[PDB]
Amino acid sequence: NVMVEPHRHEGVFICALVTKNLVPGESVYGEKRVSISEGDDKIEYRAWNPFRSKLAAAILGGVDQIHIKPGAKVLYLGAASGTTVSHVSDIVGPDGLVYAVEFSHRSGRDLINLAKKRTNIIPVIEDARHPHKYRMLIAMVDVIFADVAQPDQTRIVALNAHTFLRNGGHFVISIKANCIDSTASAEAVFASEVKKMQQENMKPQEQLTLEPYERDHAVVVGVYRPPP
Numbered sequence: 488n489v490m491v492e493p494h495r496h497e498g499v500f501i502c503a504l505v506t507k508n509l510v511p512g513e514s515v516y517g518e519k520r521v522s523i524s525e526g527d528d529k530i531e532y533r534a535w536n537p538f539r540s541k542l543a544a545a546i547l548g549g550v551d552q553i554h555i556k557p558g559a560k561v562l563y564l565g566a567a568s569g570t571t572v573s574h575v576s577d578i579v580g581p582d583g584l585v586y587a588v589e590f591s592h593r594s595g596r597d598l599i600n601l602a603k604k605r606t607n608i609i610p611v612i613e614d615a616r617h618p619h620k621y622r623m624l625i626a627m628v629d630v631i632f633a634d635v636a637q638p639d640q641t642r643i644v645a646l647n648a649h650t651f652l653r654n655g656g657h658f659v660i661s662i663k664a665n666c667i668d669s670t671a672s673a674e675a676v677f678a679s680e681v682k683k684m685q686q687e688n689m690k691p692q693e694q695l696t697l698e699p700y701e702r703d704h705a706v707v708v709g710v711y712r713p714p715p
């Protein structure tokens with residue numbers, strides 16, 4: 488009788504959505520934990536709340552790829568207090584790496600406390616608008632995740648990609664249309680942001696919206712193909 492089944496996405500499981508807890512015994516944001524013991528074996532999972540984590544909403548919504556997998560190197564822009572980052576850290580595991588870039592010092596203190604227990608998280612308390620200021624800290628990554636909410640932030644993500652994202656690496660970008668242009672339709676916003684990505688050789692491969700968890704919020708996944 489298996490209680491927690493592997494999801495299609497490696498490192499993700501269904502119990503609903505959970506990740507394998509890199510730090511057994513501890514919750515990050517009050518989430519439920521499920522510890523299963525059999526003989527001498529023991530594994531713990533943490534519930535992943537799609538109402539707080541856009542990535543979890545996208546997974547439940549059926550996104551085909553997330554590119555966040557065991558051993559992956561991740562640049563996470565807008566890491567906030569580390570809710571979603573903690574689950575990314577679970578997925579990439581001890582051989583992966585998560586750079587958690589966050590502008591707010593208050594949020595940064597939460598990230599630093601989270602990363603004390605998680606070897607694979609590097610807090611980077613900096614303004615993502617100016618990646619030249621922290622470029623010396625960031626090894627080239629496999630995937631960039633970003634939460635975009637202003638009409639200049641796809642371009643910020645792209646500037647980070649041009650500095651840090653490997654050729655043929657991937658991006659997962661959440662778009663809050665209301666925050667980009669509240670006078671535009673959500674479709675106008677999502678089309679315009681996809682266009683901005685394409686201009687930067689960030690080529691979308693799929694996109695979805697996040698109902699019932701969020702209103703007028705899309706996640707775009709794609710591939711980075713810079714010219715020579």
Ligand SMILES: Cc1cn2cc(C(F)(F)F)cc2c(=O)[nH]1
Binds near residue numbers: 565567588
């Ligand atoms: C909550 C949050 C979101 N965010 C988004 C960006 C980028 F412009 F890179 F997209 C940067 C940040 C950040 O420092 N904090």
